[PDB]
Amino acid sequence: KVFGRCELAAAMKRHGLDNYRGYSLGNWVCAAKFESNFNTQATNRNTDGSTDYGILQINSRWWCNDGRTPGSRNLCNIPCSALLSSDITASVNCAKKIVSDGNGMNAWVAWRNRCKGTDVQAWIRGCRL
Ligand SMILES: [Cl-]
Ligand SMILES: [Cl-]
Ligand code: NA
């Protein structure tokens, strides 16, 4: 599923990501935008042989199991494939865990480089929320 921008914002809010750990909805939307361009099926292989999955590019290195990342953890306790569904519940629950781990949204490099300190509100502009 490729979400629309306001469509995703509402899905994220519905799943209680808005202001989760103090991050406004616009941050989460910006993060989704630059991580997967809102596409729930996005996968990208990392140089270390791990793979990032889904709307938030959750990394098999720590967070999910894909069965091909030697020596990795599955800290969200899910198949990385669940991170690729139309329904974003699993991506949301697992992102909540990532974003609590100590570093806030800096765990997402696209957020740090492209969202952090920008006009993140604009991502939810015009949305019926
Ligand atoms: Cl593995
Ligand atoms: Cl923080
Ligand atoms: Na893993």
Residue ranges and CATH numbers for the domains of the chain are 1-129 (1.10.530.10)
Q: How far is the CA of 128 from the centre of ligand 3 (A)?
A: 37
Angle between helices 5-14 and 25-36 (to 10 degrees): 120
Q: How far is the CA of 103 from the centre of ligand 1 (A)?
A: 24
Strand order through the sheet with 58-59: 43-45, 51-53, 58-59
Q: Of 116, 74, 96, nearest to 15 (Cα)?
A: 96
Report whether 115 contacts 34 (CB < 8 A). Answer: yes
| Contacts for 121 with CB less than 8 Å, ≥ 6 apart | 24, 26
- Give the whole-angstrom CA distance, residue 39 versus residue 125: 20
Within 13 Å, how many C-alpha atoms sit on residue 74's CB side? 14
| Contacts for 4 with CB less than 8 Å, ≥ 6 apart | 38
Strand partners, 51: 45
Q: How was this structure determined?
A: X-ray
From residue 3, alpha-carbon distances to 29, 47, 127 in Å are 11, 28, 13
87 is annotated as contributing to ligand binding = no
Shortest-distance ligand to the CA of residue 51 = 3
Give the 3-state DSSP-derived string for the chain, with helices as H, strands as E and coil as C: CECCHHHHHHHHHHCCCCCHHHCCHHHHHHHHHHHHCCECCCEEECCCCCEEECCCCEECCCCCECCCCCCCCCCCCCEHHHHHCCCCHHHHHHHHHHHHCCCHHHHCHHHHHHCCCCCHHHHHCCCCC
Report whether 98 contacts 107 (CB < 8 A). Answer: yes
Residue type, 124: I
